[PDB]
Amino acid sequence: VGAXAXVXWXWXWXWX
């Protein structure tokens, strides 16, 4: 569900 690869959103992990 969405567009890309993994879970959640952005790229990487956590927040900033």
Task: Compute the distance between CA of residue 14 and CA of residue 1 in angstroms, rounded to an integer.
Answer: 20
**Which residue minimizes CB distance to K ion?**
14
Unique residue bearing structure tokens 């990487």:
12
Site string for its own copies, 1-16 (x = CB under 8 A): xxxxxxxxxxxxxxxx
* Residues that contact its own copies, how many (by CB under 8 A): 16
Task: Compute the distance between CA of residue 10 and CA of residue 16 in angstroms, rounded to an integer.
Answer: 10
Taking the complex as a whole, the smallest distance from the CB of residue 4 to K ion amounts, in Å, to: 5
Taking the complex as a whole, the smallest distance from the CB of residue 14 to K ion amounts, in Å, to: 4
8, two tokens: 């959640």
